[PDB]
């Protein structure tokens, strides 16, 4: 039940 944080908005920006 964690909240979206700026790192989640950055880690998913360019990955895989």
């Amino acid at each position: 039940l964690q909240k979206l944080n700026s790192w989640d908005v950055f880690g998913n920006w360019f990955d895989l």
Partner: antibody
Framework: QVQLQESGPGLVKPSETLSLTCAVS?????????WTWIRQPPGKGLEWIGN????????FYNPSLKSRVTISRDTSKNQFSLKVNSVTVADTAVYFCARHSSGWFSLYGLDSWGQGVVVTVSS | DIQMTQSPSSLSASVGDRVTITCRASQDITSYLAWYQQKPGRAPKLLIYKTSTLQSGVPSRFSGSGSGTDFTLTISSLQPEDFATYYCQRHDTTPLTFGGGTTVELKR
């Protein structure tokens, strides 16, 4: 530059599993956008269901529905899906799928939407 | 969790009037608020993000303001194609809740 289109059954039965899909063209699913599912009961306002990161794969849901919701993704087909299990009659609504644009460290807005899909839950 | 209220729930005004809608949260959300316009039976249209940052292609008469737990969407010189329902949205952390909505009439 981006166009979304819902697809799925417009009629399900109570307690069944609803399955909807949102095709995306003009951009990649695997990217920094957060693909979100919205719903609006007939004659009511908007209700943010959940979203999912194209690359992170993590999901976020509405706390009033996290038990019954499941968001997924399909990179090859440029699609992302939503599943609502154990549906009830009170879920009949228009289900939008939109692209929640994002910044480097700050979300932005849902700048591209689909026309929507009507789905009724009735016996 | 979060509770987003809009006010007035609906108002009527004539073309050429300066209109203003208010959207209040139940907790601080910095300058992360998004406004949307929805025509009847159609999908919403992203108007504003980041409190007052106007989305490309939106007319200049749309202006956002406020910070924290009290935001404002103002339309200078209201136009006919602006009569619709307007929603606000928290866009910083989950659950990105939408406001209750505000409908705009044409006073007659």
């Amino acid at each position: 530059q981006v166009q979304l289109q819902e697809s799925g059954p417009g009629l399900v039965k109570p307690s069944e599993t609803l399955s909807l899909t949102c095709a995306v063209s003009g951009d990649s699913i695997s990217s920094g956008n957060w693909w979100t599912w919205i719903r609006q009961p007939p004659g009511k306002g908007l209700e943010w269901i959940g979203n999912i990161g194209g690359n992170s794969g993590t999901t976020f849901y509405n706390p009033s529905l996290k038990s019954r919701v499941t968001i997924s993704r399909d990179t090859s087909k440029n699609q992302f899906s939503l599943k609502v299990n154990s549906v009830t009659v009170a879920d009949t609504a228009v289900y939008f799928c939109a692209r929640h644009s994002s910044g480097w460290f700050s979300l932005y807005g849902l700048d591209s939407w689909g026309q929507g899909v009507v789905v009724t839950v009735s016996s | 969790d979060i509770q987003m209220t809009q006010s007035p729930s609906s108002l009527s005004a004539s073309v050429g009037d300066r209109v203003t809608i208010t959207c209040r949260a139940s907790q601080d959300i910095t300058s992360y608020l998004a406004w949307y316009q929805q025509k009847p039976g159609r999908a919403p249209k992203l108007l504003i993000y980041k409190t007052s940052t106007l989305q490309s292609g939106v007319p200049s008469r749309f202006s956002g303001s406020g910070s924290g737990t009290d935001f404002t969407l103002t339309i200078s010189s209201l136009q006919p194609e602006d009569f619709a329902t307007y929603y606000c949205q928290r866009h910083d952390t989950t659950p990105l809740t939408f406001g209750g909505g505000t409908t705009v009439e044409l006073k007659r």
